[PDB]
Structure formats: C-alpha cells, structure tokens
Structure 1
Amino acid sequence: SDQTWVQCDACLKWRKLPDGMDQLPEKWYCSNNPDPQFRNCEVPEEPEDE
C-alpha cells in the first residue's frame, strides 16, 4: 500500500492523508486536515520517504 497525499489549494503544500480517504471535496485546504499537526498552511510540508 502507498501513501496518499492531497494538495492544499491555497498554499500548494502536499499533506499526507489516512489510507482509505476516497472522497474529498473539489477544493481542499490544510484547514480540513484530520491531523491537527498539519491543519495550518504555515506548517512545513513533510518530506517524502527516501
């Protein structure tokens, strides 16, 4: 299984999502992140795995 990411339409950062989130709004923003650690556009984009 792979990691899903979604791009914030405001800040253009990619955010990891939980597996199985197969329904998202047309536009998505950091503020909608289920993870409170990554719920603000100012939080840096997490790196990908090596």
Structure 2
Amino acid sequence: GSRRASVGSEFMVVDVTIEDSYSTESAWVRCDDCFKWRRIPASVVGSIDESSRWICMNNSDKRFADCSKSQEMSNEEINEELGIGQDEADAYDCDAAKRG
C-alpha cells in the first residue's frame, strides 16, 4: 500500500480600504431588527443609507422585504462572498507558531 497524504496552504489578496464597501456593484446590508444579511443593488445601496439603518421591510424586493421572510443566502456563502470570518464561536485551534 502506497498511502499518500497532503494539505493546502495559506494565500489571498490584499485590499486598500476599510470594511465598508464589499463586492463590485451589489452590496451587503444587515437588518437592524433581526440581524439578517440582505443583498441589495448598488442603485439602492446609495439611497437606503440615509440614516445608517436598514431593515428587511425596507428592502427593495417584495417577497424578501420583511423580517418575517427568510434569508437570501447561507452564512457560508456570504462569508466566502465578502471574505470575512462569520461565526466567531470558540475559535479554538492550533497556533504554537504564534505571531513572531
């Protein structure tokens, strides 16, 4: 038996701005009532931000414009979409290497 294993590596891109404008056209907005992610167009993203507050019922849609409705995408999809680290959790893992 020629058992063989391996693993990946660590590499990514680097931005030059603060976390306040992800994606290209469409943007991501969180509800200030139920705390749910909502994808909106760049056309409304520059209009709903009049009070720094957004809600489901405030959404441009009709079937997905309400706190009673459901989410548009999964946390995993959103996390990978923006490239953030959703779900803090214990976060317990190896790190013997430490910073340095």
The TM-score by the shorter chain falls in which range? 0.7 to 0.9
Structure 2 partner of 1:33: 59
Which protein, 1 or 2, shows the higher relative CO under an 8 Å CA cutoff with sep ≥ 6?
1
Shift of 1:2: 5.2
Candidates 13, 17, 22, aligned match of 2:46 = 22
- CA distance in 1 between partners of 2:31 and 2:41 (Å): 15
Aligned residues: 50
The answer for unaligned runs of 5 or more in structure 1 is: none
Give the number of the structure whose alpha-carbon radius of gyration is greater.
2
- Which structure carries more strand by proportion? 1
| Kept after mapping to 1: 8 A contact 2:31/2:37 | yes
Root-mean-square deviation (CA, aligned residues, Å) is 2.1
Deviating runs (4+, > 3 A) in structure 1?
A: none
Q: CA separation of 1:3/1:18 partners in 2, compared to 1, >3 Å: closer, same or farther?
A: closer
Work out the percentage of aligned pairs sharing the same amino acid: 38
- CA distance in 2 between partners of 1:43 and 1:3 (Å): 20
